[PDB]
Design an enzyme around this catalytic site. Structure first.
Site, PDB file in Angstrom:
ATOM      1  N   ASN A 160       0.913  -1.158   0.000  1.00  0.00           N
ATOM      2  CA  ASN A 160       0.000   0.000   0.000  1.00  0.00           C
ATOM      3  C   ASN A 160       0.943   1.195   0.000  1.00  0.00           C
ATOM      4  O   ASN A 160       1.576   1.489   1.012  1.00  0.00           O
ATOM      5  CB  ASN A 160      -0.923  -0.122   1.213  1.00  0.00           C
ATOM      6  CG  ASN A 160      -2.004   0.946   1.309  1.00  0.00           C
ATOM      7  OD1 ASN A 160      -2.494   1.199   2.404  1.00  0.00           O
ATOM      8  ND2 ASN A 160      -2.441   1.515   0.194  1.00  0.00           N
ATOM      9  N   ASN A 171      -6.406  10.347  -0.758  1.00  0.00           N
ATOM     10  CA  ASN A 171      -6.473   9.181  -1.626  1.00  0.00           C
ATOM     11  C   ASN A 171      -6.048   9.535  -3.053  1.00  0.00           C
ATOM     12  O   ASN A 171      -6.037  10.703  -3.474  1.00  0.00           O
ATOM     13  CB  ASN A 171      -7.901   8.622  -1.689  1.00  0.00           C
ATOM     14  CG  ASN A 171      -8.335   7.887  -0.431  1.00  0.00           C
ATOM     15  OD1 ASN A 171      -7.602   7.065   0.128  1.00  0.00           O
ATOM     16  ND2 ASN A 171      -9.582   8.154  -0.008  1.00  0.00           N
ATOM     17  N   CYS A 223      -5.553   6.308   8.079  1.00  0.00           N
ATOM     18  CA  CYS A 223      -4.879   5.321   7.244  1.00  0.00           C
ATOM     19  C   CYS A 223      -3.806   4.631   8.074  1.00  0.00           C
ATOM     20  O   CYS A 223      -2.857   5.280   8.550  1.00  0.00           O
ATOM     21  CB  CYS A 223      -4.277   6.000   6.024  1.00  0.00           C
ATOM     22  SG  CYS A 223      -3.221   4.957   5.050  1.00  0.00           S
ATOM     23  N   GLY A 224      -3.952   3.323   8.251  1.00  0.00           N
ATOM     24  CA  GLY A 224      -3.079   2.553   9.103  1.00  0.00           C
ATOM     25  C   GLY A 224      -1.734   2.302   8.472  1.00  0.00           C
ATOM     26  O   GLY A 224      -0.701   2.541   9.101  1.00  0.00           O
ATOM     27  N   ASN A 225      -1.711   1.829   7.231  1.00  0.00           N
ATOM     28  CA  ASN A 225      -0.431   1.691   6.545  1.00  0.00           C
ATOM     29  C   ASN A 225       0.274   3.041   6.458  1.00  0.00           C
ATOM     30  O   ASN A 225       1.495   3.128   6.618  1.00  0.00           O
ATOM     31  CB  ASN A 225      -0.627   1.068   5.169  1.00  0.00           C
ATOM     32  CG  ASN A 225      -1.059  -0.391   5.237  1.00  0.00           C
ATOM     33  OD1 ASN A 225      -0.632  -1.168   6.106  1.00  0.00           O
ATOM     34  ND2 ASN A 225      -1.927  -0.770   4.324  1.00  0.00           N
ATOM     35  N   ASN A 256     -12.729   5.797   9.488  1.00  0.00           N
ATOM     36  CA  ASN A 256     -13.222   5.675   8.127  1.00  0.00           C
ATOM     37  C   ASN A 256     -14.125   4.448   8.028  1.00  0.00           C
ATOM     38  O   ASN A 256     -14.047   3.542   8.869  1.00  0.00           O
ATOM     39  CB  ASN A 256     -12.057   5.569   7.133  1.00  0.00           C
ATOM     40  CG  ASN A 256     -11.061   4.416   7.437  1.00  0.00           C
ATOM     41  OD1 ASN A 256     -11.022   3.828   8.522  1.00  0.00           O
ATOM     42  ND2 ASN A 256     -10.233   4.106   6.433  1.00  0.00           N
ATOM     43  N   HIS A 270     -15.895   0.888   6.928  1.00  0.00           N
ATOM     44  CA  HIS A 270     -15.612  -0.447   6.412  1.00  0.00           C
ATOM     45  C   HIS A 270     -16.861  -1.311   6.391  1.00  0.00           C
ATOM     46  O   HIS A 270     -17.725  -1.230   7.269  1.00  0.00           O
ATOM     47  CB  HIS A 270     -14.525  -1.140   7.215  1.00  0.00           C
ATOM     48  CG  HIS A 270     -13.275  -0.334   7.251  1.00  0.00           C
ATOM     49  ND1 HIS A 270     -12.300  -0.466   6.288  1.00  0.00           N
ATOM     50  CD2 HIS A 270     -12.907   0.721   8.023  1.00  0.00           C
ATOM     51  CE1 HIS A 270     -11.348   0.422   6.509  1.00  0.00           C
ATOM     52  NE2 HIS A 270     -11.696   1.162   7.552  1.00  0.00           N
ATOM     53  N   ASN A 301     -15.029   1.560   2.356  1.00  0.00           N
ATOM     54  CA  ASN A 301     -14.051   0.529   2.048  1.00  0.00           C
ATOM     55  C   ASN A 301     -14.704  -0.840   2.226  1.00  0.00           C
ATOM     56  O   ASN A 301     -15.585  -1.007   3.067  1.00  0.00           O
ATOM     57  CB  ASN A 301     -12.832   0.628   2.950  1.00  0.00           C
ATOM     58  CG  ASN A 301     -12.157   1.986   2.875  1.00  0.00           C
ATOM     59  OD1 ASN A 301     -11.464   2.294   1.898  1.00  0.00           O
ATOM     60  ND2 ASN A 301     -12.377   2.817   3.885  1.00  0.00           N
ATOM     61  N   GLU A 313     -10.767  -0.422  -1.891  1.00  0.00           N
ATOM     62  CA  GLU A 313     -10.758   0.787  -1.075  1.00  0.00           C
ATOM     63  C   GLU A 313     -11.575   1.922  -1.668  1.00  0.00           C
ATOM     64  O   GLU A 313     -11.558   2.167  -2.874  1.00  0.00           O
ATOM     65  CB  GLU A 313      -9.332   1.294  -0.902  1.00  0.00           C
ATOM     66  CG  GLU A 313      -8.480   0.478   0.004  1.00  0.00           C
ATOM     67  CD  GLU A 313      -7.220   1.218   0.376  1.00  0.00           C
ATOM     68  OE1 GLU A 313      -7.234   2.470   0.516  1.00  0.00           O
ATOM     69  OE2 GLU A 313      -6.196   0.547   0.555  1.00  0.00           O
ATOM     70  N   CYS A 366      -4.444  -2.873   3.625  1.00  0.00           N
ATOM     71  CA  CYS A 366      -5.132  -1.753   4.251  1.00  0.00           C
ATOM     72  C   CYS A 366      -5.192  -1.974   5.750  1.00  0.00           C
ATOM     73  O   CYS A 366      -5.805  -2.933   6.216  1.00  0.00           O
ATOM     74  CB  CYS A 366      -6.520  -1.529   3.663  1.00  0.00           C
ATOM     75  SG  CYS A 366      -7.347  -0.083   4.392  1.00  0.00           S
ATOM     76  N   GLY A 367      -4.497  -1.105   6.488  1.00  0.00           N
ATOM     77  CA  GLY A 367      -4.404  -1.263   7.929  1.00  0.00           C
ATOM     78  C   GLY A 367      -5.721  -1.033   8.651  1.00  0.00           C
ATOM     79  O   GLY A 367      -6.117  -1.841   9.503  1.00  0.00           O
ATOM     80  N   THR A 368      -6.413   0.079   8.345  1.00  0.00           N
ATOM     81  CA  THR A 368      -7.722   0.278   8.966  1.00  0.00           C
ATOM     82  C   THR A 368      -8.661  -0.855   8.565  1.00  0.00           C
ATOM     83  O   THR A 368      -9.491  -1.285   9.367  1.00  0.00           O
ATOM     84  CB  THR A 368      -8.359   1.637   8.600  1.00  0.00           C
ATOM     85  OG1 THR A 368      -8.432   1.800   7.173  1.00  0.00           O
ATOM     86  CG2 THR A 368      -7.599   2.819   9.272  1.00  0.00           C
ATOM     87  N   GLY A 369      -8.519  -1.355   7.335  1.00  0.00           N
ATOM     88  CA  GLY A 369      -9.401  -2.410   6.862  1.00  0.00           C
ATOM     89  C   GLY A 369      -9.153  -3.726   7.586  1.00  0.00           C
ATOM     90  O   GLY A 369     -10.089  -4.464   7.898  1.00  0.00           O
TER      91      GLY A 369
HETATM   92  C1  LIG Z   1      -5.588   1.626   2.994  1.00  0.00           C
HETATM   93  C2  LIG Z   1      -5.460   2.660   4.093  1.00  0.00           C
HETATM   94  N1  LIG Z   1      -4.360   3.374   3.468  1.00  0.00           N
HETATM   95  C3  LIG Z   1      -6.711   3.528   4.265  1.00  0.00           C
HETATM   96  C4  LIG Z   1      -6.761   4.580   3.165  1.00  0.00           C
HETATM   97  C5  LIG Z   1      -8.061   5.388   3.283  1.00  0.00           C
HETATM   98  C6  LIG Z   1      -9.212   4.677   2.557  1.00  0.00           C
HETATM   99  N2  LIG Z   1      -8.932   4.577   1.120  1.00  0.00           N
HETATM  100  C7  LIG Z   1     -10.459   5.519   2.789  1.00  0.00           C
HETATM  101  O1  LIG Z   1     -10.866   6.280   1.864  1.00  0.00           O
HETATM  102  O2  LIG Z   1     -11.037   5.473   3.912  1.00  0.00           O
HETATM  103  C8  LIG Z   1      -5.057   2.020   5.440  1.00  0.00           C
HETATM  104  O3  LIG Z   1      -5.758   2.114   6.493  1.00  0.00           O
HETATM  105  O4  LIG Z   1      -3.970   1.425   5.448  1.00  0.00           O
END
Ligand SMILES: C[C@@](N)(CCC[C@H](N)C(=O)O)C(=O)O
Ligand SMILES: *C[C@@](N)(CCC[C@H](N)C(=O)O)C(=O)O
Lengths: 279, 279
Positions: B12, B65, B74-76, B163, B165, B196, B214, B223-226
């Site tokens: 990512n 984004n 964004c976790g990553n 965000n 999910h 997401n 995403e 995707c860390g939050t995911g």
């Molecule tokens: C993938 C993400 N970069 C999150 C990116 C934000 C996501 N595309 C959104 O619009 O909420 C993470 O958590 O690692």
């Protein structure tokens, strides 16, 4: 530690490496694959090396595809290299053309006043043995010939610009399921060294729309050798004149099969995007 | 003239900008779209700004984004930012954690001895109004609830990590036609701010396989939050323990729904790829 400059020619994007200190490319094919990875590396369709001239050439170009294989020529890449060389030479530059040694032969890009680059791509190669392909005998041309791909028979024409091309004319190029059928052409047994594959929609006798599945790079936004080969194929099959725009996903190229010398001339842009250094 | 460093967290990948000189981001969302374009720009899933802290935080993170939209976390990206900040601070760094202000709240990455980054991602948000989604009443959770997508009814669980999910459990995640169905989840009317979308194959109670479409970025390698939201969903639905590996296409993350403080902890890597300067 590797310093590079990112270029693209109509979105066919390349990592350019100043390799003037040695005829040995500074990275291996394996490293080029890592570098071309769009998420883990820099991201590119290929790596192009600006190498020392050979005999009566100003410089040499070698290119690695993003799969690490080494093709014999690259039209968008030659335009990018011409721009890169002009940047490297700066005010020491004393001419508007470069004679560039490639695996396919000597290629001469010309920097034009409006900022485009016009390239003498050489004679097109029309015999099957020159492609190479086994569709016909080595000393025969390959014009509107059958190619069975996944049980559907396609009409194809093959042309080499130093690298192999397989061109097929279609009614709606946007509708071609390119991700699926592309690789089936690329790796077809009829092509001992694989092939690039161009799907062409003739809009008029001076305007062709092209999509390409490239050997070693997949779906790209543009291919200069492929546009050249497609124009040649359109002339050979009576579908187009010898001067045409080839509209690619990334933009247009101007292609001319010259009646003066029978060589192919390709004109298009080259854009510098950013300079970088690997960690 | 913009200088940046390319990073990725499990593929990512992000453009990181040192924005400590001003609270105004150095680029617009429109320019971010151009910079994230993989052929015409640098190529990334997003642009992350290292910004000045905001009352009781060391720094602030804002992220665009690749479609130019601005998500809340964004976790990553936080892991990449923490690595970036450590490099910017250099020998002046005097701690192993940063308190980072985000739109979602304060997020605390910790630089761990083995080179990984462990992040306090905060409390998961479980009510429909917090996602946001209209699948349930605003004050209700959304657990194994129906969502019709192109005439097929999917069982989904929604969790917010700041965000939105939408998580669905599947038998064979590799077989999901993600390019086709992903956008239909993303823009589903049930999601006023889009979502997401994570497809999860449970291998064991401590091992989940994830693919993600995403919001604003499409198919990504991680995707860390995911992954955090998916672990929460797996606990809420009784399918997993609170400590699991989430295997993403780009590699694994370690996710913990802590029983001590009920917050989510995410541990994973961050890799500096190259530094660059736009032309
Ligand atoms: C993938 C993400 N970069 C999150 C990116 C934000 C996501 N595309 C959104 O619009 O909420 C993470 O958590 O690692
Ligand atoms: C399309 C082009 N970049 C040629 C690249 C080499 C090709 N993938 C091959 O393997 O032959 C160009 O000509 O612009």
């Amino acid at each position: 530690a590797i310093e590079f400059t990112k270029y693209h020619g109509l979105g066919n994007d390349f990592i350019l490496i100043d390799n003037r200190a040695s005829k040995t490319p500074a990275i291996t094919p394996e490293k080029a694959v890592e570098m071309c990875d769009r998420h883990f590396g820099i991201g590119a369709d290929g790596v192009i090396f600006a190498l020392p001239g050979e005999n009566g050439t100003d410089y040499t170009m070698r290119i690695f595809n993003s799969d690490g294989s080494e093709p014999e020529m690259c039209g968008n890449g030659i335009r990018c290299l011409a721009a890169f060389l002009a940047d490297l030479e700066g005010l020491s530059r004393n001419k508007d053309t470069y004679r560039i040694h490639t695996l396919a032969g000597v290629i001469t890009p010309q920097l034009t006043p409006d900022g485009q680059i016009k390239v003498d791509m050489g004679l097109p190669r029309l015999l099957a043995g020159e492609i190479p392909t086994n569709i016909a005998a080595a000393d025969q041309k390959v014009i509107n010939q059958p190619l069975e791909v996944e049980g559907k028979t396609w009409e194809v024409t093959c042309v080499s610009m130093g690298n192999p091309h397989c061109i097929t004319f279609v009614e709606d190029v946007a509708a071609i399921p390119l991700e699926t059928i592309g690789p089936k052409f690329e790796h077809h047994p009829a092509f001992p060294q694989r092939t690039n594959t161009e799907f062409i929609q003739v809009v008029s006798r001076d305007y062709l729309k092209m999509r390409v599945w490239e050997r070693g790079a997949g779906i790209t936004l543009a291919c200069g050798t492929g546009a050249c080969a497609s124009l040649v194929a359109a002339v050979l099959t009576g579908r187009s004149d010898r001067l045409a725009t080839v509209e690619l996903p990334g933009g247009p190229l101007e292609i001319e099969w010259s009646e003066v010398d029978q060589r192919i001339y390709m004109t298009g842009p080259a854009d510098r995007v950013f300079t970088g250094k690997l960690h």
